Coordinates of C-alpha atoms and ligand atoms in Angstrom, one line a residue:
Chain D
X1 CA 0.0 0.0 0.0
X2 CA 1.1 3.4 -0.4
X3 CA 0.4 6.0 1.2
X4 CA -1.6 9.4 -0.1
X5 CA 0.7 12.4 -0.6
X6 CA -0.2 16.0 -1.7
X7 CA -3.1 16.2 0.2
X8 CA -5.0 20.0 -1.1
X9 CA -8.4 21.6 -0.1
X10 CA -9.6 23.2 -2.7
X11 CA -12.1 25.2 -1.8
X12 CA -14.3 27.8 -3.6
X13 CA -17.5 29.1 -1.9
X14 CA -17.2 26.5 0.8
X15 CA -17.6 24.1 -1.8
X16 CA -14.9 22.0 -0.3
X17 CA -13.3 19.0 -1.9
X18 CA -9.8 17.3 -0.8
X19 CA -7.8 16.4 -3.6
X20 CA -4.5 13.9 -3.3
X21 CA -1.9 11.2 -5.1
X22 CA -1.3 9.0 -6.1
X23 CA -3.2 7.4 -8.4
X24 CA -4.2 4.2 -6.4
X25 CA -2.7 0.6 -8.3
X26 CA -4.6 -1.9 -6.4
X27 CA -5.6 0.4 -3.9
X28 CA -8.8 2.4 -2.5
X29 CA -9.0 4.9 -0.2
X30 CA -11.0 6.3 2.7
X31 CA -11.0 10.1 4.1
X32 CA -11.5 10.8 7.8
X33 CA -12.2 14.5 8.8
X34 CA -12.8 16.6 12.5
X35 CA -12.1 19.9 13.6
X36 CA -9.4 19.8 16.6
X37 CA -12.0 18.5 19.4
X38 CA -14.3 16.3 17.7
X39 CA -14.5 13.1 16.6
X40 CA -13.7 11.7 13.4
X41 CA -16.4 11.2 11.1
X42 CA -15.5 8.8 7.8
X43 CA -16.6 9.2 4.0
X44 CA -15.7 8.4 0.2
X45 CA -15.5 4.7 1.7
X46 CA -13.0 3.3 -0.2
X47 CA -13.2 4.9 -3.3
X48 CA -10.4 5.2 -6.2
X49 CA -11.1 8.3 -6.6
X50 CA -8.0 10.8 -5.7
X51 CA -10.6 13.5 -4.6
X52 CA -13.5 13.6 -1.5
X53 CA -16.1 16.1 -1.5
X54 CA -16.3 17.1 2.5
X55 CA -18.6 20.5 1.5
X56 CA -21.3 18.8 4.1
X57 CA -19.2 18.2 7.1
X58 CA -17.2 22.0 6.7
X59 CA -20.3 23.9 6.3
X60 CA -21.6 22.8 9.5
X61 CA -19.5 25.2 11.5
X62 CA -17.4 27.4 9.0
X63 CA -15.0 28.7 11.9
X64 CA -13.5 25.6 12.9
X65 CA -10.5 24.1 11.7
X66 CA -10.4 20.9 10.2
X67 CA -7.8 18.1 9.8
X68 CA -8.7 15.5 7.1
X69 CA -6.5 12.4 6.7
X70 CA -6.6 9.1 3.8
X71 CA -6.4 5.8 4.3
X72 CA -4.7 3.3 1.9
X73 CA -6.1 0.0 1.8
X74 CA -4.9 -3.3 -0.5
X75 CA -8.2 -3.2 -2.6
X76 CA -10.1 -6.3 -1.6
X77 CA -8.0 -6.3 1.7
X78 CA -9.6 -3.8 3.2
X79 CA -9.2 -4.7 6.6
X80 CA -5.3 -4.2 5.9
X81 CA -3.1 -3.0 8.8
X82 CA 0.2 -2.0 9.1
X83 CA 2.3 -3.3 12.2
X84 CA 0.4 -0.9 14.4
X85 CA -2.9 -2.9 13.5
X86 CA -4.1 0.3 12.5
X87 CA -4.4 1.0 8.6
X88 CA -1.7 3.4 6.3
X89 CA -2.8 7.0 6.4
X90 CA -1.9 10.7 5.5
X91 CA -2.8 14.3 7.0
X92 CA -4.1 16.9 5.3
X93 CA -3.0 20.7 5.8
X94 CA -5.5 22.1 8.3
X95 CA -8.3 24.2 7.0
X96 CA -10.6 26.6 8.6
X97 CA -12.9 26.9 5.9
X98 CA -14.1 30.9 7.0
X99 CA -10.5 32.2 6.3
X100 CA -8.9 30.1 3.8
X101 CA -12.1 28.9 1.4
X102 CA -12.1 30.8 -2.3
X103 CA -14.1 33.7 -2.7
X104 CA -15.9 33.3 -6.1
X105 CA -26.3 37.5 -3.5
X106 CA -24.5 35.1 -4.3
X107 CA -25.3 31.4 -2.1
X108 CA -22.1 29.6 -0.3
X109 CA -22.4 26.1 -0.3
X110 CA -23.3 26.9 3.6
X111 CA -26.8 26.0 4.4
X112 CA -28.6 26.8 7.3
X113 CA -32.0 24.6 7.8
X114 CA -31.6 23.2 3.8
X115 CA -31.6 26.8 2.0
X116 CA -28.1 28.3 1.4
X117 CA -27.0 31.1 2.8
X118 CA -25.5 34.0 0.6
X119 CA -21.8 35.5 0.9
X120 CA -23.5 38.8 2.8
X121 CA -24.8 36.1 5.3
X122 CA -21.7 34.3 6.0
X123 CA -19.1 37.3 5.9
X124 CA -21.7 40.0 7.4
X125 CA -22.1 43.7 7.3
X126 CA -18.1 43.6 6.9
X127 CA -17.5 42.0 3.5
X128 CA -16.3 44.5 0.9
X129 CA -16.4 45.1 -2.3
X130 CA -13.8 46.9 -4.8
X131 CA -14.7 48.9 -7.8
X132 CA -12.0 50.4 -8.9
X133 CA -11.9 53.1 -6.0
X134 CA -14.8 45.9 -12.1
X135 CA -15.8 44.8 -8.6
X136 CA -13.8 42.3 -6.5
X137 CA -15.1 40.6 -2.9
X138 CA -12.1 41.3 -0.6
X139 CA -12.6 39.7 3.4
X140 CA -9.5 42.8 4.3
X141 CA -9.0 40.7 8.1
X142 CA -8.0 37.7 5.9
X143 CA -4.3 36.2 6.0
X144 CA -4.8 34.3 3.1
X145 CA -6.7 34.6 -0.1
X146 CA -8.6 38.1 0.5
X147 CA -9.5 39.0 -2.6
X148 CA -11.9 37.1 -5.4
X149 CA -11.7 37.1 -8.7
X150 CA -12.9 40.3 -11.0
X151 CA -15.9 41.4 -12.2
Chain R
X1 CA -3.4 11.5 37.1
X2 CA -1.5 14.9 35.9
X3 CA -4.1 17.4 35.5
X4 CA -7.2 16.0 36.3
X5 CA -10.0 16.9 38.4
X6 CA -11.8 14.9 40.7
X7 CA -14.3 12.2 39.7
X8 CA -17.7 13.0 42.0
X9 CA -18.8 10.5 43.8
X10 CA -20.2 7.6 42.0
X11 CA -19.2 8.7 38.6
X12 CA -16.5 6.7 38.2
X13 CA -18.6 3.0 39.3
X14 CA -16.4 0.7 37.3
X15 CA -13.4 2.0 39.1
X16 CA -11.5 -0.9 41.2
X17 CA -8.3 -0.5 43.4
X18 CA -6.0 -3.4 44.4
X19 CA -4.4 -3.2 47.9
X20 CA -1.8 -5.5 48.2
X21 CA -0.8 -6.0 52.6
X22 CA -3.8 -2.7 52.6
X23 CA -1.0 -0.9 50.1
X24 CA -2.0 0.9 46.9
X25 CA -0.7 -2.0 44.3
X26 CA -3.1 -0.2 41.1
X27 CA -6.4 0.6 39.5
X28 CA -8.6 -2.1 37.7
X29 CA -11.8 -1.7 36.0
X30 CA -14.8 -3.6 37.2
X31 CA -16.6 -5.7 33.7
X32 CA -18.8 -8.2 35.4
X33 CA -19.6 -8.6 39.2
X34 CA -16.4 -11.2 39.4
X35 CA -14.2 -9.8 37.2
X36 CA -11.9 -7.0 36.9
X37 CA -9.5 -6.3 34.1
X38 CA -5.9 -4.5 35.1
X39 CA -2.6 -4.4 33.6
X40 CA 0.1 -7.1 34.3
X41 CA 2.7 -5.5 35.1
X42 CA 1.1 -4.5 38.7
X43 CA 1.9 -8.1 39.6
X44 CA 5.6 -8.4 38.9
X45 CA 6.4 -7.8 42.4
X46 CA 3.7 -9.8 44.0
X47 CA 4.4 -12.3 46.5
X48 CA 1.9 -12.4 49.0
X49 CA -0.8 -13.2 46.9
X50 CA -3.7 -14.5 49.6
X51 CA -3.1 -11.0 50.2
X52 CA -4.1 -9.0 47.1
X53 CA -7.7 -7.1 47.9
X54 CA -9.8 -5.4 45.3
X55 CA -12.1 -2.9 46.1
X56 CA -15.3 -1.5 44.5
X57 CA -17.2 1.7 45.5
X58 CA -14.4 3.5 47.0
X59 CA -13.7 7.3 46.6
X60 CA -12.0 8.9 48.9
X61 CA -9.0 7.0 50.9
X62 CA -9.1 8.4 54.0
X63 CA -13.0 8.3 54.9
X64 CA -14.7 5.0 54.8
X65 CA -18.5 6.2 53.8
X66 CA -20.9 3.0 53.2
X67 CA -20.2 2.3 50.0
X68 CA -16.4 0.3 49.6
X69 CA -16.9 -2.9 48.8
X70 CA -13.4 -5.2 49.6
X71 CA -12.9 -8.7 48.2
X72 CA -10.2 -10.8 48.0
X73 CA -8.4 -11.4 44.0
X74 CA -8.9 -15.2 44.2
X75 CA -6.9 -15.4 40.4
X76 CA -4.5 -12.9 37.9
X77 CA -4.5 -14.4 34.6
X78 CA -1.8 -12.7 32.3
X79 CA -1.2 -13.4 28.2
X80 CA 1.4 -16.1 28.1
X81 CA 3.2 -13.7 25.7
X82 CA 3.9 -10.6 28.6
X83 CA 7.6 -10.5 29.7
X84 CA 7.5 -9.7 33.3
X85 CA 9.4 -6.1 33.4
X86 CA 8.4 -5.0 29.7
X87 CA 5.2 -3.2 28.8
X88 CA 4.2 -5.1 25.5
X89 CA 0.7 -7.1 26.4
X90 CA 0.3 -5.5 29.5
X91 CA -2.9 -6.9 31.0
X92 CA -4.3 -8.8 33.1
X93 CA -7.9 -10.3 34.1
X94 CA -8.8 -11.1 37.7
X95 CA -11.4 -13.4 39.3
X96 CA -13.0 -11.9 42.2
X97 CA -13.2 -14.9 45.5
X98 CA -17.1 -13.7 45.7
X99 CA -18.8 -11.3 43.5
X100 CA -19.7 -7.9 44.4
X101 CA -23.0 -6.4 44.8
X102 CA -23.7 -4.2 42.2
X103 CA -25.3 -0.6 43.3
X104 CA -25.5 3.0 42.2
X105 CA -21.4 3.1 43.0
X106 CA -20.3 -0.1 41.6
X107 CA -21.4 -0.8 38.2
X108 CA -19.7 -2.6 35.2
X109 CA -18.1 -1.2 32.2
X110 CA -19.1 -2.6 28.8
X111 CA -16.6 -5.2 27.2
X112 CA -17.1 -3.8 23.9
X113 CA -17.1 -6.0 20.9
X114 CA -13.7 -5.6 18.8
X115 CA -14.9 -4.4 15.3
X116 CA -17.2 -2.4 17.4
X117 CA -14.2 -1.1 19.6
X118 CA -11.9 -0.9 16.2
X119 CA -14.1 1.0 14.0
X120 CA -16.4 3.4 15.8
X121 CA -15.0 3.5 19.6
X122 CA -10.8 4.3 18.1
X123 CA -12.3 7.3 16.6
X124 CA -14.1 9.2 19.4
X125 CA -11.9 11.4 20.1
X126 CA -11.7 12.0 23.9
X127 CA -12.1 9.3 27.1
X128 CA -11.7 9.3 30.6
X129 CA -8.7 8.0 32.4
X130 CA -8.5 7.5 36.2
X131 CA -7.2 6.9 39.4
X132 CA -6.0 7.9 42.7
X133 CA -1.9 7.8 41.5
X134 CA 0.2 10.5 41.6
X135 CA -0.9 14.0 40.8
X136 CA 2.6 15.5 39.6
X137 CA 5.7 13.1 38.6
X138 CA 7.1 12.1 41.9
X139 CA 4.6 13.9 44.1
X140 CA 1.5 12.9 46.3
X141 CA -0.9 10.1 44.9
X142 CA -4.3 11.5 45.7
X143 CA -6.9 10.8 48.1
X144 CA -9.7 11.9 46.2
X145 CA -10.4 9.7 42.5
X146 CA -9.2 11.9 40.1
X147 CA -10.4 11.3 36.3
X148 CA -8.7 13.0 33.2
X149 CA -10.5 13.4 29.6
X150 CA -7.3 12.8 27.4
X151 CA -7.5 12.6 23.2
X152 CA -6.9 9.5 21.5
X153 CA -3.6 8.9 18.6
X154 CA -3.2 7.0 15.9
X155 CA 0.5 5.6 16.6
X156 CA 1.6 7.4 13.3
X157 CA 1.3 11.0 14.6
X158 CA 2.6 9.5 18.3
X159 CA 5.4 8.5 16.4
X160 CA 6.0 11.5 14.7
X161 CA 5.3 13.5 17.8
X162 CA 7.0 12.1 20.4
X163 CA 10.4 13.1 21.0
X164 CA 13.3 9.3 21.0
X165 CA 15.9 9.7 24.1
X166 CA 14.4 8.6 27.2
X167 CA 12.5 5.2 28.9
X168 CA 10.5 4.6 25.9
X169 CA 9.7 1.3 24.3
X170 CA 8.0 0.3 21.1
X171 CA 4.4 1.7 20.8
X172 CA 3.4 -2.1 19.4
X173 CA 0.1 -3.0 18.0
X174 CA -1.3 -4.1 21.3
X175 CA -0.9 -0.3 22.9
X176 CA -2.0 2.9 22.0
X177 CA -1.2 6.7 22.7
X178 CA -3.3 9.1 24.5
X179 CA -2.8 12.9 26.3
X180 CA -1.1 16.0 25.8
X181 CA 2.5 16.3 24.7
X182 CA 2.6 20.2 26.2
X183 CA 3.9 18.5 29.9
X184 CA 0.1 19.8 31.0
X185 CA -1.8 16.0 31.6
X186 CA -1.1 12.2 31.6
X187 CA -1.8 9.3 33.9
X188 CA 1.0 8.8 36.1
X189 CA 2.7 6.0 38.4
X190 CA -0.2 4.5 40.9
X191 CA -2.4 4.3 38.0
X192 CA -1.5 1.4 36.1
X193 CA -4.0 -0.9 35.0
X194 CA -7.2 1.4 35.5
X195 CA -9.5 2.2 32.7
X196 CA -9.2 4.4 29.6
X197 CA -13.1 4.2 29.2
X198 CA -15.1 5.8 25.9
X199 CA -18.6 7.4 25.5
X200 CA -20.6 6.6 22.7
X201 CA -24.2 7.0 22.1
X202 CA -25.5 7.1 25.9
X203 CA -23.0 3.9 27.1
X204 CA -19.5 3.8 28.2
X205 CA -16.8 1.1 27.2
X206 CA -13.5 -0.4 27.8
X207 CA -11.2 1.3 25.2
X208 CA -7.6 0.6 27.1
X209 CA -5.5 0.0 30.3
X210 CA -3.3 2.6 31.9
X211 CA 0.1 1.2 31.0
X212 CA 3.0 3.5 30.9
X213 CA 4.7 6.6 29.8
X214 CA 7.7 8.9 29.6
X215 CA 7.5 10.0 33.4
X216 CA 3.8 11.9 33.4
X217 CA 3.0 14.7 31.2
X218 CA 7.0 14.7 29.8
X219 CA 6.9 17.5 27.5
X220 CA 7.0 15.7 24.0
X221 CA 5.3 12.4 25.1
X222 CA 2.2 11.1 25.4
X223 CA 0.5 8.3 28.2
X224 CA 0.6 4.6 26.5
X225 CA -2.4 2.6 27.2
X226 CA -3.0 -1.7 26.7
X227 CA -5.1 -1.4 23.3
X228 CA -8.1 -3.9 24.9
X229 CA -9.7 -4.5 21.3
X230 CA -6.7 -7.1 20.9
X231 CA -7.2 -9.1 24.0
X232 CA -11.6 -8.9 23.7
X233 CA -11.6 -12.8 22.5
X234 CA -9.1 -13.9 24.4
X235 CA -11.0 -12.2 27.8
X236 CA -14.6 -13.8 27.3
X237 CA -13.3 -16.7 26.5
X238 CA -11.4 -16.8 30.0
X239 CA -14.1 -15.5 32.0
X240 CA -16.0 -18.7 30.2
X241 CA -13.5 -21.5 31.2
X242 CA -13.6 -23.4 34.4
X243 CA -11.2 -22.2 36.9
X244 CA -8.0 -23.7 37.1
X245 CA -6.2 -24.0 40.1
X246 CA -3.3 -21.2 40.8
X247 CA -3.1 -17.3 42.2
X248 CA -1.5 -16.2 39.2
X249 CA -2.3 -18.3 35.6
X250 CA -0.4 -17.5 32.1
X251 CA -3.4 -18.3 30.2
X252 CA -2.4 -18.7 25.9
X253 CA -2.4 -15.7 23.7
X254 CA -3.9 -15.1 20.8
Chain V
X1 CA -19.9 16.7 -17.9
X2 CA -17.1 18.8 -17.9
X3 CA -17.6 22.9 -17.3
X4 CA -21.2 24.2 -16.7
X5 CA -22.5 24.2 -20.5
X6 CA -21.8 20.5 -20.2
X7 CA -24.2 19.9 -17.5
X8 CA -21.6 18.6 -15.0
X9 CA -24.1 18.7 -12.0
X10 CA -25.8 15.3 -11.7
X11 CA -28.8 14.7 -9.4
X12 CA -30.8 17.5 -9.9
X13 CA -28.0 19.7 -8.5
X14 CA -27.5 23.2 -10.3
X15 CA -23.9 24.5 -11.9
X16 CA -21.9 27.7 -11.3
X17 CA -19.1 28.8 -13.5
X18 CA -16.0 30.1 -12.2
X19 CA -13.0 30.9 -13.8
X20 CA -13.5 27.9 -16.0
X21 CA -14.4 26.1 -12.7
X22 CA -17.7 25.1 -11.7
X23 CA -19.2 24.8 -8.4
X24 CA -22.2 22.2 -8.3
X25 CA -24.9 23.2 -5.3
X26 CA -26.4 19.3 -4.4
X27 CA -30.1 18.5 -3.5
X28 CA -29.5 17.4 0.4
X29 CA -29.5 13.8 -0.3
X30 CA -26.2 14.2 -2.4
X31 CA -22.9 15.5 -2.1
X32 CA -19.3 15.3 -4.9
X33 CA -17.7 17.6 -7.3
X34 CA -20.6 16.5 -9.4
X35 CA -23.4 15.8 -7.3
X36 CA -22.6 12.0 -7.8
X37 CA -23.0 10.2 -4.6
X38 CA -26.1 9.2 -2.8
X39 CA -26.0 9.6 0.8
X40 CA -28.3 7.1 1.2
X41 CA -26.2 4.6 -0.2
X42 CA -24.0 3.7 2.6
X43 CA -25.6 2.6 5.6
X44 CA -22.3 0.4 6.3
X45 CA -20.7 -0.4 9.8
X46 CA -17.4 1.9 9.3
X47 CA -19.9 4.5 8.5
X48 CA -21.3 6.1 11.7
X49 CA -21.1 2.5 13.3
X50 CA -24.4 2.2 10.5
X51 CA -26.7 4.6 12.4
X52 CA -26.6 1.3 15.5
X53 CA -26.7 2.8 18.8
X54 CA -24.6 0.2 20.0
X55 CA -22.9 -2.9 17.7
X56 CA -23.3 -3.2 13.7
X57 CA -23.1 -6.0 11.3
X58 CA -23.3 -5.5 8.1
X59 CA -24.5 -8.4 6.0
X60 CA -23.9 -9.9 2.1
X61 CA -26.5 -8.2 -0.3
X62 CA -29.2 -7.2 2.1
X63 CA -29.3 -4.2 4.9
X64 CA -27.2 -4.4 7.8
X65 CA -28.4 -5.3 11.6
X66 CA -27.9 -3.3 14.6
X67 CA -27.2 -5.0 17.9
X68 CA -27.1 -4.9 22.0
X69 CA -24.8 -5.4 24.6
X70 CA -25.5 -8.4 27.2
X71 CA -28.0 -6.7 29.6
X72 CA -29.9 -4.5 26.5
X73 CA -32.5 -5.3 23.9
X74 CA -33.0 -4.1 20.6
X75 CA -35.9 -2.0 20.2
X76 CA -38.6 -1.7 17.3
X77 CA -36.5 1.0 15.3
X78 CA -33.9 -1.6 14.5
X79 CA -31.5 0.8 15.9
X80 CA -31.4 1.6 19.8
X81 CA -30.7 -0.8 22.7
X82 CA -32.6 -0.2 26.1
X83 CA -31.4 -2.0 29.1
X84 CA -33.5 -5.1 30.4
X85 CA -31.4 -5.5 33.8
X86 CA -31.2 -3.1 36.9
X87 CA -27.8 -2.4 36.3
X88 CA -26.6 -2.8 32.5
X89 CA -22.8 -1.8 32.3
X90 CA -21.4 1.1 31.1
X91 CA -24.3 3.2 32.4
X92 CA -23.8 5.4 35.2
X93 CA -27.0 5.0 37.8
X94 CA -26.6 8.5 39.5
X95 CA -26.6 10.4 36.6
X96 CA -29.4 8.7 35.0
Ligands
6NH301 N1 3.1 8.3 32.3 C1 2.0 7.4 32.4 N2 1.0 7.6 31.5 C2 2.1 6.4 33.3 C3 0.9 5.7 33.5 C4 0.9 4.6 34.4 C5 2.1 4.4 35.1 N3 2.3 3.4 36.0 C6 3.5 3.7 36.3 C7 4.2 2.8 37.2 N4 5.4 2.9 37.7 N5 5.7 1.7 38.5 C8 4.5 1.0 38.5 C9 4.2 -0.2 39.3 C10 3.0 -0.3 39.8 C11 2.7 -1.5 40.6 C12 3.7 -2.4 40.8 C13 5.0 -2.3 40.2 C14 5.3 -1.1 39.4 C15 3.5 1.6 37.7 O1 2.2 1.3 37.5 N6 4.2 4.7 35.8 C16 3.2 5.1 35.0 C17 3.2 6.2 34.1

């Protein structure tokens, strides 16, 4: 088995998906994710995919950080262990999804009783917009990423 | 326990504590009215063996309240494949001479069955460990129970956490890493073989022993706990078998 | 599909270009890139120990079985356990 590598959120919107390598010969995979205190919740169950959407479980609480991690499994054997009786695995970067996810009114991924909630709703009366003085969202508190695209 | 806070009364029921000549020997944890599962090591040193005592109910050391419930170990059954002195299969099952009486401060924890315990109880983050060992490396074991709610590893990140150079064996398949590597909290010496016991859906099980660790709370270590889920089978299957003869039994393991 | 004029979304789920990007906004019983998977398809034992309160089996071709500890029964929703004894294990009596 070898392990995932290049483990990447790519996030736009909070439309969340991890991304990672290799290509799997003979292998599937399984992500875990949590934010720092909470348990680890499991999904694309062994897939051969080299991506898992995890929009669902980020958009629950937006501010947290999360930690995602891979499994590699002989496909077939996939009760496979290494010598720790515990199955090969990788980290993902960690990801807060309110500070780091892609700015593209307009919905988020982020729904709040089934309905999505808009950009205004998630970033508040202190999201801003460029003009010029061609518009362009910019979240100014932001480390990373700050400003969208243009318009 | 490093950092913990007391367990209230009664919240802690499965809690056992082996006296050995009315001394502190270690913790157990209470699965069935006769049985109590510890961690062999405690037993290295035994000799007078009529004399090892478990007790149920207790809380606080000093005052006897109603509640303590004392009976004698009649039998310590260790994996044939512990190595008296080492840490690797570190635990140990113990008949009870009489069964206890099972009230609101003495109650069993849940054997859990081993897919069960490897699939959904490895990933809940945080469980309780406990007992009335020291509070500090080297200082005073406490009077009071003291629980701690440390967060489970997978032994790749204790691996890559943990800093080599000091008394550290192999974190084997049959053990597993749980605590804080900032010096803060850990289980510590008068601990061993007391439970590392997990919440899930309204019941609590038996996740792990209190085995060992780099001092307690060691700045770059984490506490090492008997990974139960290996020994499940093995356990049931001794609480099932007619009772041989002998204090202390090597019973075949796997 | 591939980018929005190619219907990427599957499921019912509706497309947004980005810079040749797309973002696909699922119906709430799906989730992927492309609205692909079904979360009602896997109601396995790794996943969320299979919605079992307490032990999970999963079973060749047909719907996995929830089950109890010693001391617990299963109840009619297939799922939960509820203690048939005065003092089932792992329960702590003065906090219930
Ligand atoms: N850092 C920890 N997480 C830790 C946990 C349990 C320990 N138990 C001990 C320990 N040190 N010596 C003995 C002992 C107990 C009874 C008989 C013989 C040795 C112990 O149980 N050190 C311990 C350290």
């Amino acid at each position: 088995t070898v392990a995932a590598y290049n483990l990447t959120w790519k996030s736009t919107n909070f439309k969340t998906i991890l991304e990672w390598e290799p290509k799997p010969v003979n292998q599937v995979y399984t992500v875990q994710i949590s934010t720092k205190s909470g348990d680890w919740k499991s999904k694309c169950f062994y897939t051969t995919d080299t991506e898992c959407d995890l929009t669902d479980e980020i958009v629950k609480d937006v501010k947290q950080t999360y930690l995602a991690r891979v499994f590699s499994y002989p496909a077939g054997n996939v009760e496979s262990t290494g010598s720790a009786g515990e199955p090969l695995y990788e980290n993902s970067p960690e990801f807060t999804p309110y500070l780091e996810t892609n700015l593209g009114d307009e919905r988020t991924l982020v729904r709040r009783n089934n309905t999505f909630l808009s950009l205004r709703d998630v970033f508040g009366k202190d999201l801003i917009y460029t003009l010029y003085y061609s518009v362009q969202a910019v979240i100014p508190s932001r480390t990373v990423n700050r400003k969208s695209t243009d318009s | 326990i490093v950092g913990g806070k007391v367990c209230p009364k009664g919240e802690c029921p499965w809690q056992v504590l082996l006296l050995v000549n009315g001394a502190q020997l270690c913790g157990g944890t209470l699965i069935n009215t006769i049985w109590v599962v510890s961690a062999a090591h405690c037993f290295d040193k035994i000799k007078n063996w009529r004399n090892l005592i478990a007790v149920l109910g207790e809380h606080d050391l000093s005052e006897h309240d109603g509640d303590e419930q004392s009976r004698r170990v009649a039998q310590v059954i260790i994996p044939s494949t512990y190595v008296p002195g080492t840490t690797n299969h570190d635990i140990a099952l113990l008949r009870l001479h009489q069964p206890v009486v099972l009230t609101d401060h003495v109650v069993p924890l849940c054997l859990p069955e081993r897919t069960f315990s490897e699939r959904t109880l490895a990933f809940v983050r945080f469980s309780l460990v406990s007992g009335w060992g020291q509070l500090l490396d080297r200082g005073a074991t406490a009077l009071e129970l003291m629980v701690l709610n440390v967060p489970r590893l997978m032994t790749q990140d204790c691996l890559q956490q943990s800093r080599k150079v000091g008394d550290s064996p192999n974190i084997t398949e049959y053990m597993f890493c749980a605590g804080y590597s900032d010096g803060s909290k850990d289980s510590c010496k008068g601990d061993s073989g007391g439970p590392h016991a997990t919440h899930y859906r309204g019941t609590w099980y038996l996740t792990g022993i209190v085995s060992w660790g780099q001092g307690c709370a060691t700045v770059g270590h984490f506490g090492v706990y008997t990974r139960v889920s290996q020994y499940i089978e093995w356990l049931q299957k001794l609480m099932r078998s007619e009772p041989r003869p002998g204090v202390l039994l090597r019973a075949p393991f796997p | 599909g591939d980018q929005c004029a190619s219907s990427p979304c599957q499921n019912g789920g509706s497309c947004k270009d980005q810079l040749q990007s797309y973002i696909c906004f699922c119906l709430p019983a799906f989730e992927g890139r492309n609205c692909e998977t079904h979360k009602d398809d896997q109601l396995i034992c790794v996943n969320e120990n299979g919605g079992c309160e307490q032990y999970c089996s999963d079973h060749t071709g047909t719907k996995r079985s929830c089950r109890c500890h010693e001391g617990y029964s299963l109840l009619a929703d297939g799922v939960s356990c509820t203690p048939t004894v005065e003092y089932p294990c792992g329960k702590i009596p003065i906090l219930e």
